[PDB]
Protein backbone atom coordinates (compact mmCIF):
# COMPACT_ATOMS: atom_id res chain seq x y z
CA UNK A 1 0.00 0.00 0.00
CA UNK A 2 0.64 3.83 -0.22
CA UNK A 3 3.19 5.59 -2.45
CA UNK A 4 6.90 5.24 -3.38
CA UNK A 5 8.92 8.04 -1.76
CA UNK A 6 11.13 10.38 -3.84
CA UNK A 7 14.68 11.21 -2.71
CA UNK A 8 16.30 14.66 -2.92
CA UNK A 9 18.70 14.25 -5.81
CA UNK A 10 22.36 14.67 -4.89
CA UNK A 11 23.92 16.75 -7.73
CA UNK A 12 27.16 15.89 -9.60
CA UNK A 13 30.25 18.18 -9.38
CA UNK A 14 32.31 18.98 -12.51
CA UNK A 15 44.16 9.45 5.87
CA UNK A 16 40.38 9.56 5.79
CA UNK A 17 38.13 11.63 3.57
CA UNK A 18 34.28 12.06 3.64
CA UNK A 19 31.53 13.74 1.69
CA UNK A 20 28.04 14.20 3.01
CA UNK A 21 24.85 15.32 1.22
CA UNK A 22 22.14 16.57 3.63
CA UNK A 23 18.69 17.55 2.37
CA UNK A 24 16.12 19.18 4.60
CA UNK A 25 12.41 19.83 4.14
CA UNK A 26 11.16 22.26 6.90
CA UNK A 27 7.45 22.10 7.28
CA UNK A 28 5.37 24.73 9.08
CA UNK A 29 1.65 24.23 9.55
CA UNK A 30 1.50 21.14 7.33
CA UNK A 31 2.74 21.90 3.87
CA UNK A 32 1.48 25.54 4.09
CA UNK A 33 5.05 26.85 4.52
CA UNK A 34 7.97 24.83 3.26
CA UNK A 35 11.65 25.74 3.32
CA UNK A 36 13.98 23.46 1.45
CA UNK A 37 17.76 23.35 1.92
CA UNK A 38 20.35 21.00 0.50
CA UNK A 39 23.87 20.94 2.06
CA UNK A 40 27.01 19.85 0.22
CA UNK A 41 29.71 18.91 2.77
CA UNK A 42 33.32 17.91 2.49
CA UNK A 43 34.59 16.20 5.64
CA UNK A 44 32.56 18.43 7.98
CA UNK A 45 32.89 21.57 5.91
CA UNK A 46 29.66 22.70 4.32
CA UNK A 47 31.00 24.33 1.09
CA UNK A 48 27.83 24.66 -1.16
CA UNK A 49 24.13 25.06 -0.29
CA UNK A 50 20.75 25.43 -2.04
CA UNK A 51 18.19 27.33 -0.05
CA UNK A 52 14.67 27.82 -1.33
CA UNK A 53 14.40 31.16 0.52
CA UNK A 54 17.38 32.38 -1.51
CA UNK A 55 16.24 30.64 -4.71
CA UNK A 56 19.57 29.43 -5.91
CA UNK A 57 22.85 27.71 -5.06
CA UNK A 58 25.46 29.74 -3.09
CA UNK A 59 29.07 28.93 -2.22
CA UNK A 60 29.26 28.89 1.58
CA UNK A 61 33.06 28.67 1.58
CA UNK A 62 35.92 28.79 -1.06
CA UNK A 63 35.89 25.05 -1.63
CA UNK A 64 32.43 25.59 -3.24
CA UNK A 65 33.46 28.49 -5.50
CA UNK A 66 34.19 26.17 -8.47
CA UNK A 67 30.63 24.69 -8.19
CA UNK A 68 28.04 27.49 -7.67
CA UNK A 69 27.81 28.72 -11.29
CA UNK A 70 27.84 25.24 -12.87
CA UNK A 71 25.12 24.13 -10.41
CA UNK A 72 22.93 27.14 -11.01
CA UNK A 73 23.26 26.55 -14.77
CA UNK A 74 23.04 22.80 -14.75
CA UNK A 75 20.65 21.95 -11.86
CA UNK A 76 18.64 24.88 -10.68
CA UNK A 77 15.12 24.31 -12.10
CA UNK A 78 15.04 20.65 -11.09
CA UNK A 79 16.37 21.52 -7.59
CA UNK A 80 13.85 24.30 -7.18
CA UNK A 81 11.02 21.96 -8.13
CA UNK A 82 12.04 19.48 -5.31
CA UNK A 83 10.28 21.72 -2.81
CA UNK A 84 7.12 20.23 -4.37
CA UNK A 85 8.23 16.92 -5.87
CA UNK A 86 10.25 15.91 -2.71
CA UNK A 87 9.00 17.92 0.26
CA UNK A 88 5.29 18.42 -0.40
CA UNK A 89 4.93 15.02 -2.08
CA UNK A 90 6.69 12.93 0.60
CA UNK A 91 4.83 14.76 3.33
CA UNK A 92 1.26 14.50 1.87
CA UNK A 93 1.55 11.06 0.31
CA UNK A 94 3.79 9.19 2.82
CA UNK A 95 4.22 10.93 6.21
CA UNK A 96 0.49 11.57 6.62
CA UNK A 97 -0.34 7.85 6.92
CA UNK A 98 2.79 6.91 8.96
CA UNK A 99 4.87 9.40 10.97
CA UNK A 100 2.13 11.98 11.43
CA UNK A 101 -0.39 9.35 12.50
CA UNK A 102 1.99 7.67 15.02
CA UNK A 103 0.61 7.96 18.56
CA UNK A 104 2.22 6.03 21.40
CA UNK A 105 0.77 6.43 24.89
CA UNK A 106 3.18 7.04 27.81
CA UNK A 107 3.90 4.55 30.54
CA UNK A 108 3.90 6.39 33.93
CA UNK A 109 5.74 4.76 36.95
CA UNK A 110 6.78 6.26 40.35
CA UNK A 111 9.80 4.87 42.10
CA UNK A 112 12.00 5.96 45.08
CA UNK A 113 15.52 7.15 44.33
CA UNK A 114 14.70 10.61 49.45
CA UNK A 115 13.69 11.36 45.87
CA UNK A 116 10.60 10.23 44.06
CA UNK A 117 11.09 9.67 40.29
CA UNK A 118 8.23 9.89 37.87
CA UNK A 119 9.39 7.91 34.75
CA UNK A 120 7.27 8.66 31.65
CA UNK A 121 8.39 6.34 28.88
CA UNK A 122 7.66 4.97 25.43
CA UNK A 123 5.65 7.85 24.09
CA UNK A 124 5.28 9.57 20.66
CA UNK A 125 5.16 12.34 19.52
CA UNK A 126 7.48 14.61 21.58
CA UNK A 127 5.00 17.01 23.16
CA UNK A 128 4.46 16.18 26.84
CA UNK A 129 3.60 17.69 30.24
CA UNK A 130 4.55 16.02 33.50
CA UNK A 131 3.84 17.59 36.92
CA UNK A 132 4.34 16.51 40.52
CA UNK A 133 1.54 17.21 43.03
CA UNK A 134 1.67 16.97 46.84
CA UNK A 135 -1.63 16.43 48.79
CA UNK A 136 -3.50 17.93 45.82
CA UNK A 137 -1.35 21.02 45.04
CA UNK A 138 1.37 21.47 42.40
CA UNK A 139 4.92 20.97 43.67
CA UNK A 140 7.65 23.06 41.97
CA UNK A 141 10.44 23.48 44.52
CA UNK A 142 13.08 20.74 44.40
CA UNK A 143 11.61 19.34 41.09
CA UNK A 144 13.86 18.74 38.13
CA UNK A 145 12.91 17.16 34.80
CA UNK A 146 15.37 15.72 32.24
CA UNK A 147 15.26 17.12 28.74
CA UNK A 148 13.30 14.97 26.26
CA UNK A 149 15.24 11.74 25.88
CA UNK A 150 15.10 10.28 22.28
CA UNK A 151 15.37 6.50 22.53
CA UNK A 152 16.27 6.26 18.78
CA UNK A 153 13.47 3.68 18.25
CA UNK A 154 10.59 6.11 17.51
CA UNK A 155 9.84 6.61 21.22
CA UNK A 156 10.71 9.22 23.89
CA UNK A 157 11.12 9.28 27.70
CA UNK A 158 11.29 12.02 30.35
CA UNK A 159 12.21 11.59 34.08
CA UNK A 160 10.95 14.04 36.70
CA UNK A 161 12.64 13.87 40.18
CA UNK A 162 11.03 15.32 43.35
CA UNK A 163 13.27 15.76 46.51
CA UNK A 164 10.94 14.75 49.37
CA UNK A 165 10.06 13.87 52.98
CA UNK A 166 8.00 10.64 53.25
CA UNK A 167 5.68 11.83 56.09
CA UNK A 168 2.66 9.71 57.01
CA UNK A 169 -0.67 10.67 55.42
CA UNK A 170 1.17 12.60 52.69
CA UNK A 171 -0.04 11.87 49.13
CA UNK A 172 2.12 12.49 46.04
CA UNK A 173 0.79 12.42 42.46
CA UNK A 174 2.53 12.49 39.07
CA UNK A 175 0.18 14.01 36.41
CA UNK A 176 0.85 13.49 32.63
CA UNK A 177 -0.78 15.06 29.54
CA UNK A 178 0.14 13.90 26.00
CA UNK A 179 -1.67 14.13 22.51
CA UNK A 180 -2.34 10.34 22.77
CA UNK A 181 -4.38 10.72 25.97
CA UNK A 182 -8.08 11.79 26.16
CA UNK A 183 -7.55 12.90 29.74
CA UNK A 184 -4.51 13.10 31.98
CA UNK A 185 -2.87 10.06 33.46
CA UNK A 186 -2.35 10.26 37.28
CA UNK A 187 -0.33 7.89 39.35
CA UNK A 188 -0.09 8.00 43.18
CA UNK A 189 2.57 7.29 45.71
CA UNK A 190 1.75 7.00 49.46
CA UNK A 191 4.16 6.85 52.36
CA UNK A 192 4.78 4.05 53.03
CA UNK A 193 5.90 3.15 49.48
CA UNK A 194 2.72 3.83 47.30
Amino acid sequence: RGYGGRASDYKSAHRHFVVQFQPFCYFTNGTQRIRYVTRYIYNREEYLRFDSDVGEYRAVTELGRPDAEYYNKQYLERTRAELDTVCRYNYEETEVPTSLRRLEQPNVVISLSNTLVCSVTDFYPAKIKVRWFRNGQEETVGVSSTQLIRNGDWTFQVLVMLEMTPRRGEVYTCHVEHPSLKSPITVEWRAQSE
Binding site: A7, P23, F27, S113
Partner: protein
Amino acid sequence: IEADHVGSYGIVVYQSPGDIGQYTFEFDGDELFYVDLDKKETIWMLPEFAQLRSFDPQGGLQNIATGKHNLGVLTKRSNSTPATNEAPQATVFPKSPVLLGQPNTLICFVDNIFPPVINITWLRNSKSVADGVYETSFFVNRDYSFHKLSYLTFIPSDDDIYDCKVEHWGLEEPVLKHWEPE
Protein backbone atom coordinates in the same frame (compact mmCIF):
# COMPACT_ATOMS: atom_id res chain seq x y z
CA ILE B 1 16.27 26.26 11.49
CA GLU B 2 12.68 26.13 12.84
CA ALA B 3 9.51 24.32 11.67
CA ASP B 4 6.88 21.92 12.97
CA HIS B 5 8.53 18.99 11.08
CA VAL B 6 11.79 18.21 9.29
CA GLY B 7 12.17 15.45 6.70
CA SER B 8 15.57 14.51 5.23
CA TYR B 9 14.88 12.49 2.09
CA GLY B 10 18.20 10.97 1.08
CA ILE B 11 21.23 11.63 3.35
CA VAL B 12 24.31 10.38 1.55
CA VAL B 13 27.56 9.63 3.39
CA TYR B 14 30.54 8.47 1.29
CA GLN B 15 34.05 7.80 2.68
CA SER B 16 37.47 6.55 1.58
CA PRO B 17 39.44 4.39 1.88
CA GLY B 18 37.06 1.47 1.72
CA ASP B 19 34.23 2.88 -0.41
CA ILE B 20 32.15 3.16 2.75
CA GLY B 21 28.64 4.39 2.06
CA GLN B 22 25.47 5.02 4.01
CA TYR B 23 22.12 6.02 2.66
CA THR B 24 19.15 7.16 4.88
CA PHE B 25 15.85 8.86 5.33
CA GLU B 26 14.98 10.70 8.58
CA PHE B 27 11.81 12.37 9.75
CA ASP B 28 11.66 14.55 12.85
CA GLY B 29 15.11 13.14 13.80
CA ASP B 30 14.16 9.44 13.67
CA GLU B 31 15.38 6.90 11.11
CA LEU B 32 12.70 5.88 8.55
CA PHE B 33 15.11 3.45 6.90
CA TYR B 34 18.58 2.89 5.49
CA VAL B 35 19.34 1.24 2.13
CA ASP B 36 21.48 -1.80 2.51
CA LEU B 37 23.83 -1.12 -0.44
CA ASP B 38 25.11 -4.74 -0.65
CA LYS B 39 21.68 -6.40 -0.62
CA LYS B 40 20.10 -3.52 -2.53
CA GLU B 41 17.19 -3.39 -0.09
CA THR B 42 15.28 -0.68 1.77
CA ILE B 43 15.49 -1.65 5.53
CA TRP B 44 12.67 0.05 7.55
CA MET B 45 13.12 0.62 11.25
CA LEU B 46 9.33 0.23 11.86
CA PRO B 47 8.18 -2.76 9.71
CA GLU B 48 4.65 -1.45 10.03
CA PHE B 49 5.63 1.67 7.95
CA ALA B 50 6.88 -0.62 5.14
CA GLN B 51 3.23 -1.76 4.60
CA LEU B 52 2.11 1.82 4.24
CA ARG B 53 4.72 3.50 1.93
CA SER B 54 7.76 2.46 0.08
CA PHE B 55 11.14 3.36 -1.32
CA ASP B 56 12.88 1.85 -4.31
CA PRO B 57 16.46 1.13 -3.19
CA GLN B 58 17.89 2.04 -6.63
CA GLY B 59 17.36 5.65 -5.44
CA GLY B 60 20.05 4.96 -2.76
CA LEU B 61 22.49 3.29 -5.18
CA GLN B 62 22.18 6.22 -7.65
CA ASN B 63 22.85 8.86 -4.95
CA ILE B 64 25.78 6.82 -3.50
CA ALA B 65 27.35 6.60 -7.01
CA THR B 66 27.13 10.43 -7.07
CA GLY B 67 28.85 10.39 -3.64
CA LYS B 68 31.72 8.21 -4.93
CA HIS B 69 32.17 10.82 -7.74
CA ASN B 70 31.85 13.97 -5.65
CA LEU B 71 34.37 12.57 -3.14
CA GLY B 72 36.98 12.09 -5.96
CA VAL B 73 36.36 15.65 -7.10
CA LEU B 74 36.30 17.33 -3.69
CA THR B 75 39.25 15.43 -2.25
CA LYS B 76 41.51 16.65 -5.16
CA ARG B 77 39.93 20.07 -4.95
CA SER B 78 40.84 20.48 -1.23
CA ASN B 79 44.45 19.36 -1.93
CA SER B 80 43.62 16.09 -0.15
CA THR B 81 42.88 17.75 3.20
CA PRO B 82 42.01 14.73 5.50
CA ALA B 83 39.28 14.53 8.13
CA THR B 84 40.35 15.48 11.67
CA ASN B 85 39.18 12.95 14.33
CA GLU B 86 36.87 13.79 17.22
CA ALA B 87 36.41 11.98 20.53
CA PRO B 88 32.93 10.34 20.72
CA GLN B 89 30.98 10.51 24.00
CA ALA B 90 28.84 7.58 25.39
CA THR B 91 25.82 7.58 27.73
CA VAL B 92 24.09 4.40 28.97
CA PHE B 93 20.42 4.44 30.12
CA PRO B 94 17.57 1.92 30.36
CA LYS B 95 14.58 2.12 27.93
CA SER B 96 12.10 1.85 30.83
CA PRO B 97 12.26 1.80 34.68
CA VAL B 98 14.35 -1.21 35.79
CA LEU B 99 12.14 -3.71 37.75
CA LEU B 100 12.92 -7.36 38.56
CA GLY B 101 10.66 -9.65 36.51
CA GLN B 102 10.50 -7.24 33.58
CA PRO B 103 12.63 -7.64 30.40
CA ASN B 104 14.05 -4.28 29.40
CA THR B 105 16.57 -2.67 26.97
CA LEU B 106 19.83 -0.85 27.81
CA ILE B 107 20.53 1.96 25.31
CA CYS B 108 24.04 3.23 24.56
CA PHE B 109 23.82 6.63 22.94
CA VAL B 110 27.12 7.76 21.34
CA ASP B 111 27.46 11.42 20.20
CA ASN B 112 30.24 13.57 18.64
CA ILE B 113 31.21 10.82 16.20
CA PHE B 114 33.54 11.97 13.43
CA PRO B 115 34.43 10.45 11.16
CA PRO B 116 31.44 7.96 11.06
CA VAL B 117 33.40 4.71 11.54
CA ILE B 118 33.00 3.18 15.01
CA ASN B 119 32.74 -0.09 16.93
CA ILE B 120 30.11 -0.07 19.73
CA THR B 121 29.87 -3.30 21.65
CA TRP B 122 28.38 -4.52 24.95
CA LEU B 123 29.86 -6.28 27.96
CA ARG B 124 27.83 -8.25 30.56
CA ASN B 125 29.93 -8.86 33.68
CA SER B 126 33.10 -7.88 31.74
CA LYS B 127 32.52 -10.46 29.03
CA SER B 128 31.42 -9.89 25.44
CA VAL B 129 27.82 -10.40 24.35
CA ALA B 130 26.48 -10.62 20.76
CA ASP B 131 22.96 -11.96 21.57
CA GLY B 132 20.16 -9.43 21.88
CA VAL B 133 22.08 -6.49 20.29
CA TYR B 134 20.75 -4.05 17.63
CA GLU B 135 22.29 -0.75 16.43
CA THR B 136 20.97 2.23 14.45
CA SER B 137 22.64 3.95 11.42
CA PHE B 138 24.58 7.23 11.91
CA PHE B 139 22.26 10.15 12.50
CA VAL B 140 23.29 13.61 11.31
CA ASN B 141 24.05 16.47 13.76
CA ARG B 142 23.80 20.22 13.16
CA ASP B 143 27.68 20.52 13.29
CA TYR B 144 28.07 17.59 10.84
CA SER B 145 29.48 15.06 13.25
CA PHE B 146 27.11 12.07 13.88
CA HIS B 147 25.31 10.14 16.63
CA LYS B 148 24.48 6.44 16.71
CA LEU B 149 22.66 4.18 19.24
CA SER B 150 23.14 0.59 20.28
CA TYR B 151 20.72 -1.68 22.21
CA LEU B 152 21.03 -4.68 24.50
CA THR B 153 17.87 -6.52 25.70
CA PHE B 154 18.28 -7.70 29.27
CA ILE B 155 16.47 -9.30 32.25
CA PRO B 156 17.11 -7.03 35.31
CA SER B 157 19.03 -8.63 38.21
CA ASP B 158 21.17 -7.49 41.16
CA ASP B 159 23.92 -9.94 40.06
CA ASP B 160 24.74 -8.32 36.68
CA ILE B 161 26.76 -5.30 35.62
CA TYR B 162 27.19 -3.74 32.19
CA ASP B 163 29.52 -1.71 29.94
CA CYS B 164 29.04 -0.14 26.53
CA LYS B 165 32.45 -0.22 24.81
CA VAL B 166 33.24 2.30 22.09
CA GLU B 167 36.30 2.07 19.82
CA HIS B 168 37.08 4.99 17.54
CA TRP B 169 40.20 6.53 15.89
CA GLY B 170 39.61 9.73 17.92
CA LEU B 171 40.17 7.76 21.14
CA GLU B 172 43.54 7.05 22.81
CA GLU B 173 41.83 4.10 24.56
CA PRO B 174 38.29 2.57 24.18
CA VAL B 175 35.50 4.26 26.21
CA LEU B 176 33.92 1.77 28.67
CA LYS B 177 30.67 3.34 29.92
CA HIS B 178 29.62 1.40 32.92
CA TRP B 179 26.09 0.70 34.11
CA GLU B 180 24.50 -1.13 37.02
CA PRO B 181 21.02 -1.34 38.58
CA GLU B 182 20.83 0.29 42.04
